[PDB]
Amino acid sequence: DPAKAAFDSLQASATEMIGYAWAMVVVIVGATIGIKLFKKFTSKAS
Amino acid sequence: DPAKAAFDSLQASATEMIGYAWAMVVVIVGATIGIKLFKKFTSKAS
Amino acid sequence: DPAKAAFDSLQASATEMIGYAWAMVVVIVGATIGIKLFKKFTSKAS
Amino acid sequence: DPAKAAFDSLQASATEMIGYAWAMVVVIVGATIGIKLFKKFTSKAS
Amino acid sequence: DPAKAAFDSLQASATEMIGYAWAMVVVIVGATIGIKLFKKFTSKAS
Amino acid sequence: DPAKAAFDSLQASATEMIGYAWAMVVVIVGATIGIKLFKKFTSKAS
Amino acid sequence: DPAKAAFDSLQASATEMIGYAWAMVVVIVGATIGIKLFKKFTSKAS
Amino acid sequence: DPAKAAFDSLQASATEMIGYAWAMVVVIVGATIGIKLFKKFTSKAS
Amino acid sequence: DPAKAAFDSLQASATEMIGYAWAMVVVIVGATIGIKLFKKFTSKAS
Amino acid sequence: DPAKAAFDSLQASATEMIGYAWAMVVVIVGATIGIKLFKKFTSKAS
Amino acid sequence: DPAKAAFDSLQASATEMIGYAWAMVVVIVGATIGIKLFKKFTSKAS
Amino acid sequence: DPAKAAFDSLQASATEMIGYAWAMVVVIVGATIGIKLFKKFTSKAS
Amino acid sequence: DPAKAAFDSLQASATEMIGYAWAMVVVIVGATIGIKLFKKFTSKAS
Amino acid sequence: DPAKAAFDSLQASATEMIGYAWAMVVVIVGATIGIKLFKKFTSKAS
Amino acid sequence: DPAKAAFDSLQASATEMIGYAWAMVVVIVGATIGIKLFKKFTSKAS
What burial class does residue E17 get, using C-beta atoms within 10 Å of its C-beta: 0-12 exposed, 13-18 middle, 19+ buried? Predict the structure, then answer.
């Protein structure tokens, strides 16, 4: 069955991209939250 | 009746593909919603 | 009348095929609408 | 009538999904409002 | 006139399906608007 | 002239069918537009 | 002219729905503004 | 020339329908913009 | 040559119809684009 | 060339609508900014 | 070769229309972006 | 029977072409879906 | 063999037309994509 | 077998075009995401 | 190969537009951030 194999391959490609997307999100969000806390704690400290 | 058998076969093939489609959708949607909640809760928490 | 009998048989065959077609349509459309609602409600819920 | 039965089934499936969506919404919103009040009352108390 | 009768029947079938479609729309839209208001009022209340 | 009469009859039959077609179109289009506006205004109102 | 009548009916249906939409908007907006002022004046008063 | 007359009639019918379409658009758009401004000014005023 | 004359006449008739077709297109397209811009600018303005 | 004339007319219609849109924007924005400054200066003055 | 000449003419007509299309786009987009910036800067300024 | 052999050969040729068609489809669809997901996940990630 | 020569000539004519078709496609598609990107980047930039 | 060779060639051409498409996508998406992050980080930084 | 050349040209056009878009963004963002800092520092200074 040609269809069975095809869908398997598609689903594997998708799984890989999702992997790459998670990596990126973690970097960008890391920095957004980083800057937010730096602004907040500096104010409270002083 | 040749037609009866033919339609049966077609309907079985279709049933199988629908199976494969559901698998894929669950993966892709899983990740979309995953990233959305991660962005949202991280913000509220901080 | 040979013609009368012939048309009757043709009309019966057609009636049967229409039956098989309805079965198939209900399956395919079932899945199309299924996936559409799953995508829509998941988004609104989150 | 094939159509009557078909629409009934579709409408039942939809009713079930709506059920699942309400469950999810209640969890997510529960937490959003939870965190908001915790932040607010802690501040006023101190 | 065979045509007159035929068109009458078609138009009756269509009228019935439109009936079933209205039922479905009312359910789906009911839930979409329901969730939207629940999200909105909960926020304003808190 | 046999032809003159024949064409007259054909043209009358056609005129009648066009009549029946207009009736049907008005029903189907009525519902399509109906549902579209219901979806649109409900959203804006809420 | 079948078209003239058809458009008239469509335009009447639309006019009615707009009526129902205005009713809903007035209720929802009434409450949103109500809560906003209650929050604001209570604070200033105390 | 049969064609000349025919095209003239078609073009007149089209001109009339365009007339009816403009009437409808003005009503629907009138209400959409109406509701949008009511929501916006009420908020700013309060 | 009978053929030469015949083709000339055909080609003239065609040229005339193309003329009538251009007139119609300009009217219909005029209105389609008209309504599209009215919808678009009204939204942006408000 | 039928096309040249057609595009000219379309472009003139568009130019006119843009004119009407600018008029509206100036009114709405005038009021939004008006209310904003009234709220701001009254507070600072008192 | 009749074909060579024909394609040349078609390609020239197309080139001219593309010219007219660019003119229109520049006008419409000019205004869309114009209104967007006016709304944005007025807000920031005040 | 010359006919029996002939139909067998035709049916074999067809079976082979279907094979080649499946190969091509899998490549083209692979890329279409690939690009679609790349566009979608990149947006959500950022 | 008269047939051999004939097919050769036909195949040459076809090859030439395909050449002219490619030229045209490149112009039309050039403009379609051009306008699409102009609309997209102008929006993002502003 | 003429068909076998033909399909092979088609599939090779397609493979090459897909190559060129990927190149273009990477450029366009590169810039879209670039501008988005520049807008976002500049705001948070200031 | 006509396709190879075509894609090259498209990709060059795109590269140029991206250039123009970056220029615009730098101007608009320059001013937005400019005004924001002027408002902020003036307040803190006084």
Answer: middle
- CA dist list (Å): O37 to C44, J44, O34: 38, 21, 5
Report helix angle O2-45 to K2-45, nearest 10: 10
Q: Which of N36, N15, L44 is nearest to A17 (CA)?
A: L44
**Residue in this structure with the two tokens 């009978």, named with its chain if needed:** I2
Q: Which residues contact H18 (CB under 8 A, 6 or more apart)?
A: I27, I28, I31
Method in brief: cryo-EM
Give the closest residue to L20 by CA, choosing from F5, N45, N10: N10
Resolution (A): 2.6
Whose tokens are 């102008």? That residue is M42
Contacts of O23 in chain N (CB under 8 A): none
Structural class in CATH, domain L1-46: mainly alpha
Residues D1/C22, Cβ–Cβ less than 8 Å: no
Long-range residue pairs from F34-42, CB within 8 A, at least 24 positions apart, any chain: F34/G13, F35/E21, F35/E22, F35/E25, F37/G13, F37/G14, F37/G17, F37/H28, F38/E25, F38/E29, F38/G17, F39/E25, F39/E29, F41/G17, F41/G18, F41/G20, F41/G21, F41/H31, F42/E29, F42/E33, F42/G21
The alpha-carbon gap from H27 to the nearest alpha carbon of chain F, in Å, equals 12
Contact flag I20-H29 (C-beta cutoff 8 Å)? no
Q: Which amino acid is at I46?
A: S
Structural contact between residues G21 and F45, judged by C-beta atoms closer than 8 angstroms: yes
